[PDB]
Amino acid sequence: HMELEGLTALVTGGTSGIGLESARLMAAEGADVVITGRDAQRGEQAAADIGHGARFVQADLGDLDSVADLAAQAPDVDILVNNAGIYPQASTFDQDVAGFQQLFDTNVRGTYFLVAAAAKGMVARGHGSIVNITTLAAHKGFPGTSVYGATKAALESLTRTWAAEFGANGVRVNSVSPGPTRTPTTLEQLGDFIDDVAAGLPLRRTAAPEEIAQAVLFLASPRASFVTGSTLYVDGGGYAV
Amino acid sequence: HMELEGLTALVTGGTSGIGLESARLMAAEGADVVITGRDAQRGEQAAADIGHGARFVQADLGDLDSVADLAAQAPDVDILVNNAGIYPQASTFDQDVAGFQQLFDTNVRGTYFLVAAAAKGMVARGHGSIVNITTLAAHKGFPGTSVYGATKAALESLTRTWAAEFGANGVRVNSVSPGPTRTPTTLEQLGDFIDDVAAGLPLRRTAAPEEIAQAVLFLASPRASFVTGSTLYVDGGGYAV
Amino acid sequence: MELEGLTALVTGGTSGIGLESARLMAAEGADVVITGRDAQRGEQAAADIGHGARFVQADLGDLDSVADLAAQAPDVDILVNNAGIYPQASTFDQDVAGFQQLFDTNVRGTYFLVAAAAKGMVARGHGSIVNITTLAAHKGFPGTSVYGATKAALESLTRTWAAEFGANGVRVNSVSPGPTRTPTTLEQLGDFIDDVAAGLPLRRTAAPEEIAQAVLFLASPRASFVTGSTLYVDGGGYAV
Amino acid sequence: MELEGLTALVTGGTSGIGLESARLMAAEGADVVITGRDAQRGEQAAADIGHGARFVQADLGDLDSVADLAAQAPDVDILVNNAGIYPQASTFDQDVAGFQQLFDTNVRGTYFLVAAAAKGMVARGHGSIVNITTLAAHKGFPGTSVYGATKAALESLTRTWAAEFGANGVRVNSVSPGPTRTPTTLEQLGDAAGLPLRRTAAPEEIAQAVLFLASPRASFVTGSTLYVDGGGYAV
Ligand SMILES: NC(=O)c1ccc[n+]([C@@H]2O[C@H](COP(=O)([O-])OP(=O)(O)OC[C@H]3O[C@@H](n4cnc5c(N)ncnc54)[C@H](OP(=O)(O)O)[C@@H]3O)[C@@H](O)[C@H]2O)c1
Ligand SMILES: NC(=O)c1ccc[n+]([C@@H]2O[C@H](COP(=O)([O-])OP(=O)(O)OC[C@H]3O[C@@H](n4cnc5c(N)ncnc54)[C@H](OP(=O)(O)O)[C@@H]3O)[C@@H](O)[C@H]2O)c1
Ligand SMILES: NC(=O)c1ccc[n+]([C@@H]2O[C@H](COP(=O)([O-])OP(=O)(O)OC[C@H]3O[C@@H](n4cnc5c(N)ncnc54)[C@H](OP(=O)(O)O)[C@@H]3O)[C@@H](O)[C@H]2O)c1
Numbered sequence: 040h041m042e043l044e045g046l047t048a049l050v051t052g053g054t055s056g057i058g059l060e061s062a063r064l065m066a067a068e069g070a071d072v073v074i075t076g077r078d079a080q081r082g083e084q085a086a087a088d089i090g091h092g093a094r095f096v097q098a099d100l101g102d103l104d105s106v107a108d109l110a111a112q113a114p115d116v117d118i119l120v121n122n123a124g125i126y127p128q129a130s131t132f133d134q135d136v137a138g139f140q141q142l143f144d145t146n147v148r149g150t151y152f153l154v155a156a157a158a159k160g161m162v163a164r165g166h167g168s169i170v171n172i173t174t175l176a177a178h179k180g181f182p183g184t185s186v187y188g189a190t191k192a193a194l195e196s197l198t199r200t201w202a203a204e205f206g207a208n209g210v211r212v213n214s215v216s217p218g219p220t221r222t223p224t225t226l227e228q229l230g231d232f233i234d235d236v237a238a239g240l241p242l243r244r245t246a247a248p249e250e251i252a253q254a255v256l257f258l259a260s261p262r263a264s265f266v267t268g269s270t271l272y273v274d275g276g277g278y279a280v
Numbered sequence: 281h282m283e284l285e286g287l288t289a290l291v292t293g294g295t296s297g298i299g300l301e302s303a304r305l306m307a308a309e310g311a312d313v314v315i316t317g318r319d320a321q322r323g324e325q326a327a328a329d330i331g332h333g334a335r336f337v338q339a340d341l342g343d344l345d346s347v348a349d350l351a352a353q354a355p356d357v358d359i360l361v362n363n364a365g366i367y368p369q370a371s372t373f374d375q376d377v378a379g380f381q382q383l384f385d386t387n388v389r390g391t392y393f394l395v396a397a398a399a400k401g402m403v404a405r406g407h408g409s410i411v412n413i414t415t416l417a418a419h420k421g422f423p424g425t426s427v428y429g430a431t432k433a434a435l436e437s438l439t440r441t442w443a444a445e446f447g448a449n450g451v452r453v454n455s456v457s458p459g460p461t462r463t464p465t466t467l468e469q470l471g472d473f474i475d476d477v478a479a480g481l482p483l484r485r486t487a488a489p490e491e492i493a494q495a496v497l498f499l500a501s502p503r504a505s506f507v508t509g510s511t512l513y514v515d516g517g518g519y520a521v
Numbered sequence: 522m523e524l525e526g527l528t529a530l531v532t533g534g535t536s537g538i539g540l541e542s543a544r545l546m547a548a549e550g551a552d553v554v555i556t557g558r559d560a561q562r563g564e565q566a567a568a569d570i571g572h573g574a575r576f577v578q579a580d581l582g583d584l585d586s587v588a589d590l591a592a593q594a595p596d597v598d599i600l601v602n603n604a605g606i607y608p609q610a611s612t613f614d615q616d617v618a619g620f621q622q623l624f625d626t627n628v629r630g631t632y633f634l635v636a637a638a639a640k641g642m643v644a645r646g647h648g649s650i651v652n653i654t655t656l657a658a659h660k661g662f663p664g665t666s667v668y669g670a671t672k673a674a675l676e677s678l679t680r681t682w683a684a685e686f687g688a689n690g691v692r693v694n695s696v697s698p699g700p701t702r703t704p705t706t707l708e709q710l711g712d713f714i715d716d717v718a719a720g721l722p723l724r725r726t727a728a729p730e731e732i733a734q735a736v737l738f739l740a741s742p743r744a745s746f747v748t749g750s751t752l753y754v755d756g757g758g759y760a761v
Numbered sequence: 762m763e764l765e766g767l768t769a770l771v772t773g774g775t776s777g778i779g780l781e782s783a784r785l786m787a788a789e790g791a792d793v794v795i796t797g798r799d800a801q802r803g804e805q806a807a808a809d810i811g812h813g814a815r816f817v818q819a820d821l822g823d824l825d826s827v828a829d830l831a832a833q834a835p836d837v838d839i840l841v842n843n844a845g846i847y848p849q850a851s852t853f854d855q856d857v858a859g860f861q862q863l864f865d866t867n868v869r870g871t872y873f874l875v876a877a878a879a880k881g882m883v884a885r886g887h888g889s890i891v892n893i894t895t896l897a898a899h900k901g902f903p904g905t906s907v908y909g910a911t912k913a914a915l916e917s918l919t920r921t922w923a924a925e926f927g928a929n930g931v932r933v934n935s936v937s938p939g940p941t942r943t944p945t946t947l948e949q950l951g952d953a954a955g956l957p958l959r960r961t962a963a964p965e966e967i968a969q970a971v972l973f974l975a976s977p978r979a980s981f982v983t984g985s986t987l988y989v990d991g992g993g994y995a996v
């Protein structure tokens with residue numbers, strides 16, 4: 040239980056759901072974990088549940104000054120899990136401009152400029168692993184998810200460009216594309232949606248967040264030392280059908 | 281013999297390059313063609329050279345008020361070609377915030393809300409065809425194209441979602457993903473870049489803009505009556521290698 | 522007449538998607554050769570098409586027949602690899618003999634016909650090769666395991682051939698169709714294509730003429746910069 | 762401890778990627794059965810692996826040998842379809858006999874081994890199948906036409922099998938490796954530079970991907986391709 044000993048791991052949106060479980064797995068493997076989120080009360084609680092010296096830093100990925108402060112507060116990261124993200128739904132005809140801009144500001148812009156800062160240090164040191172959390176709706180057309188799927192699709196392309204830009208200096212970049220997963224947000228907002236998506240999956244069920252974190256752990260760890268530029272689908276068969 | 285006789289088409293960025301050749305092919309096929317651009321002088325010259333009653337409407341895809349006024353001036357369209365776009369290059373470490381936001385405003389946001397307006401009439405009438413121009417860098421990792429490829433990969437996802445949302449009402453949606461093409465902008469800005477990309481293509485050459493336009497015409501026309509939600513790669517084999 | 526002066530060979534050109542592809546190309550001025558196993562159906566198909574289209578009898582599952590076909594039509598500019606069978610069975614039900622027949626017909630016959638015909642294209646410096654695949658080679662449909670695999674092998678062959686022949690100007694592409702109303706899909710698989718169509722954004726099956734239009738495009742000079750790619754003609758099947 | 766109580770069958774487990782995959786699983790508590798044609802290397806590989814691992818001789822090109830193999834291990838929880846060959850020749854140079862052997866070995870033998878082993882997995886309601894493919898099945902590399910076609914067929918089978926068996930809890934996935942320093946590859950290549958990582962892989966690096974997909978860690982991963990190729994597919 041020491042495969043990540045000596046590595047610092049930053050997990051955006053790591054105070055709930057898939058981010059919480061990914062930070063838990065990496066702390067248990069000996070990494071020094073930093074998690075971020077907006078709600079300070081819930082972030083400090085999440086860092087205690089995780090234990091192993093995990094610490095919380097408040098940051099809003101939608102504000103670029105906050106992103107730059109986060110990068111300043113963790114200038115030595117070996118594992119970056121870009122997990123923070125929102126996914127409100129609306130048909131194209133119902134979608135508003137302000138919601139469009141917040142989705143791109145949060146899901147794309149904040150992750151882009153955090154990577155620009157953190158990867159520079161990884162490239163200097165000659166080692167690092169970056170994992171971007173995407174979505175099945177970025178690979179198939181589900182009505183109501185045009186904007187959300189478009190943000191994660193841009194992340195899929197960034198995974199490829201970044202892997203080619205940083206690979207010469209030993210830095211790996213990959214995506215984890217999850218299917219419908221039971222998290223507090225999906226339970227509150229999209230309770231029937233995830234169940235409807237699940238009826239069309241081969242495994243015919245939704246995922247526990249731990250099952251998604253297991254794929255994040257693999258790609259972050261040195262077990263995936265030859266894995267870069269790729270997408271790891273964790274969707275119970277959704278992309279296959 | 282004019283297969284598009286009776287239809288109205290709107291080509292964004294149709295005053296030079298791939299867009300101008302797509303408009304010329306459609307106007308020759310008997311469609312009533314509207315072309316848009318930012319510079320009014322070169323717009324009127326383009327409309328004049330195209331002939332066949334083609335008209336110009338000035339619009340800036342980056343300004344949403346301008347996009348709204350464009351939708352008003354061309355309300356009922358049967359063919360929409362989303363071709364307008366920009367592609368400046370920079371490494372992820374050199375990329376600036378202003379340039380990031382302009383690339384997404386022009387390539388993604390403007391097309392999104394033009395479609396939201398144009399597709400409403402296509403759905404009500406029960407027929408229509410939308411063609412989105414993407415890029416090879418959205419499917420393979422090219423250093424220096426992180427943002428640009430990310431904007432076009434968002435558009436690839438929108439093609440899938442939109443085809444699922446508008447399909448029941450007869451509206452088709454597809455992408456054309458071009459390889460390196462000789463245009464006014466690539467010959468003045470990316471002269472050595474396109475030949476470098478051409479060297480690793482199975483066809484070992486760059487394309488004329490008309491060669492890209494033939495794919496756009498096919499997808500816009502009743503010949504492609506069963507084609508929707510897909511990408512047509514016109515790239516000399518780049519995606520295959 | 523876009524295809525004037527060009528010779529086109531269509532395997533399985535006596536019925537269904539192949540028949541309509543040959544009809545389109547003949548109407549474009551091409552000298553079309555259609556092939557099939559049944560001599561009566563072939564002669565009737567050539568008359569139905571017109572335009573000097575001629576029939577040549579061959580069995581793609583027999584390599585001697587394949588070699589005999591390439592000898593009767595040595596100089597082809599357009600080759601449409603359309604002949605194929607698609608019987609359905611779950612993996613637990615699938616028999617050995619049907620497995621071998623599916624690969625013999627759908628893969629081996631096309632491979633060595635391409636090896637023969639593409640030699641002349643490469644030496645002449647031009648040509649277009651269109652391989653007919655299937656949606657089941659891209660998504661998992663129960664009961665189509667062997668069929669999808671043969672067409673997936675064909676998809677990969679498109680990429681390898683595009684790279685090997687592209688230096689000499691020869692293009693290679695795949696057409697991946699959705700459920701199409703041919704006499705075979707109506708006799709057998711009658712309700713399967715309906716179930717598939719209900720899950721497509723267009724919510725319908727295709728007429729064979731609609732698949733043929735994609736074959737015509739990739740085969741013609743209009744697609745001069747298109748090689749190594751898959752053109753999906755499936756009502757949105759791949760996107761959902 | 763993670764694979765304790767499970768039985769894993771690795772075809773081509775006496776060398777290269779297969780040997781390292783079977784090694785990782787045995788060291789995780791699985792009862793490992795490896796298979797190959799050569800009996801002397803097979804018994805050595807079984808002793809090399811240790812942990813009670815055993816060797817069963819079989820030729821994937823002979824369906825009677827494949828049937829005998831399945832009957833000697835009817836209770837497999839993990840199946841790694843790793844045996845394969847990859848000779849090269851341009852399309853114009855490819856011979857009929859070599860074409861048929863490539864499909865007989867890489868596709869037919871795997872297909873009917875799966876048809877037997879998946880029955881027990883479906884009955885029990887759990888199991889994991891891992892098919893080893895190749896980058897050449899997704900990109901066009903001159904000289905790999907037949908080899909890549911056989912692996913592309915496996916890629917499609919992964920999806921169909923995921924749909925057919927997933928209705929009863931059985932997962933099926935592909936592992937697509939890049940260039941790897943196995944004994945066959947070192948002899949065939951003699952004297953990679955286009956990959957983002959700019960190096961070839963050690964066999965153990967491919968085996969780690971096999972292990973993850975085979976283990977309960979990947980409990981929600983099915984029908985997918987895991988690319989372990991130094992960035993080849995992305996470029
Ligand atoms: N079904 C699924 O759950 C599913 C499926 C596919 C993909 N995904 C992807 O998986 C990722 C995580 O999913 P999830 O269900 O675990 O989400 P979640 O439970 O709602 O948690 C999201 C995390 O992101 C943080 N966050 C949200 N907006 C932020 C902002 N503007 N700045 C900084 N942090 C912000 C939240 O912290 P605060 O509450 O303090 O703001 C929270 O810690 C997302 O990117 C999602 O797109 C999820
Ligand atoms: N090698 C290639 O050329 C290549 C390869 C792959 C993909 N593509 C894609 O193909 C499309 C066209 O490429 P191209 O080379 O033909 O471009 P181009 O020659 O430079 O022409 C661009 C057109 O878009 C218009 N435009 C630019 N910015 C605009 C804005 N903010 N608002 C409204 N109109 C705007 C321009 O009008 P004004 O001149 O008046 O500003 C012009 O008519 C682009 O979307 C590009 O991403 C090109
Ligand atoms: N729904 C669909 O129809 C659909 C969907 C996706 C893909 N496809 C693919 O599209 C292609 C054509 O489909 P289709 O429905 O139009 O087929 P079809 O109507 O049943 O006709 C098949 C053609 O192939 C010939 N053929 C069959 N076996 C042959 C052999 N061993 N050697 C030589 N010729 C042979 C037949 O002629 P003879 O009978 O006289 O031998 C016939 O001309 C097939 O490759 C199929 O896999 C079809």
Ligand SMILES: NC(=O)c1ccc[n+]([C@@H]2O[C@H](COP(=O)([O-])OP(=O)(O)OC[C@H]3O[C@@H](n4cnc5c(N)ncnc54)[C@H](OP(=O)(O)O)[C@@H]3O)[C@@H](O)[C@H]2O)c1
Nearest residue numbers: 773775776777778797798799820821844845940941943945
């Ligand atoms: N660079 C790479 O090495 C590379 C790259 C991409 C994909 N792959 C894939 O990875 C897999 C393993 O690669 P590898 O380099 O480790 O191969 P390898 O070292 O040559 O070992 C192949 C194994 O398959 C067995 N085998 C061969 N033919 C057989 C047959 N007819 N029946 C039964 N067993 C048979 C061999 O046993 P015997 O010696 O006793 O016959 C041996 O154990 C292959 O499927 C290959 O396609 C490899």
